[PDB]
Design a protein around this ligand. Sequence first.
Ligand SMILES: Nc1ncnc2c1ncn2[C@@H]1O[C@H](COP(=O)(O)OP(=O)(O)NP(=O)(O)O)[C@@H](O)[C@H]1O
Ligand SMILES: *[C@@H]1[C@@H](C(=O)OC(C)(C)C)C(=O)CC[C@]1(C)C(=O)OC
Length: 336
Amino acid sequence: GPEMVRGQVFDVGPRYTNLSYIGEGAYGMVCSAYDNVNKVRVAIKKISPFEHQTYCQRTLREIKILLRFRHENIIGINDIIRAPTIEQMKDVYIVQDLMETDLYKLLKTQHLSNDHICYFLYQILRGLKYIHSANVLHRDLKPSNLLLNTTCDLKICDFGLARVATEYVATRWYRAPEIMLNSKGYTKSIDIWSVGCILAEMLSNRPIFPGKHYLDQLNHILGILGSPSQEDLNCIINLKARNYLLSLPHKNKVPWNRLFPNADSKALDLLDKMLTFNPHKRIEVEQALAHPYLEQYYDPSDEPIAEAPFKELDDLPKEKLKELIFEETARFQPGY
Ligand SMILES: Nc1ncnc2c1ncn2[C@@H]1O[C@H](COP(=O)(O)OP(=O)(O)NP(=O)(O)O)[C@@H](O)[C@H]1O
Ligand SMILES: *[C@@H]1[C@@H](C(=O)OC(C)(C)C)C(=O)CC[C@]1(C)C(=O)OC
């Protein structure tokens, strides 16, 4: 019958065999496998989203975007397996290139040198430059979706929340303050904040803004950035959120070099421009790439961009979204 892993059906044979559990997100279970047709190792993510409108959104968005992106620092989709009829389709298997680990797992075991922080940071921004050039926001960057192979190549993954320029997630320590405040008008700078948070974690092997909920999270951010300036306050669109922040006790800014006393000063300069409360003043991806911290790797001629930008699913019921997912995956079926 179907192949099985940890008591879960992984029906991807006969082409894909030798499944080995890797890990699990909040939505997908991921295995390595062997592709007997191309004679290569792959990863396969199983998702079962059709009972939940929000899971269907995640699935459709990830498939749609990843199939149009092609970049060394972004995971590609090789193949997609699902049932030959929509009525039988309950699971979707997304076949991707196999990576060895992710930044979350690496940081649990290793303290990175500065040269490795620069390289990983550069690869993040190089992928993000292409993403943002397509007018796409990733919106959920975090260490666990920064995949790594043995050659230390880095590929961004997990585009279920991506959108052209929310919902429950397993972590929001990497979310920009405006996400927790304004609740609308999200820009490319929200990704830059997330990258700033990842840079900080690579510098200390600890998350910079942990917190049990949004309120606690904002207190962590404010406890380091200090109370928002007048100009900062004006860039908050929702007046009730602005009044909330006005209600909090005053907080002084903690100098970055007190938090990271041994870090390279160039790294902290870039971190400061990334973890800027005001999204309009936050450094942009191409400016970050050209920052002196990254001069060993910066090479605009080898930092490609998308040919052209992309240019809604919240209203669609889950039955409509399942039709759309069936349609989007037909190109991997025989007889399309
Ligand atoms: N192509 C891949 N190669 C190797 N490991 C992978 C690959 N894709 C995912 N993983 C691992 O599997 C984990 C879960 O993948 P992910 O795509 O984030 O699942 P998700 O449930 O859909 N979203 P999330 O809950 O945010 O993690 C990742 O954090 C990696 O550890
Ligand atoms: C990284 C070093 C390494 O072992 O990578 C990790 C797995 C620890 C991240 C190494 O062996 C020499 C230098 C590299 C390859 C590197 O990327 O330097 C820029």
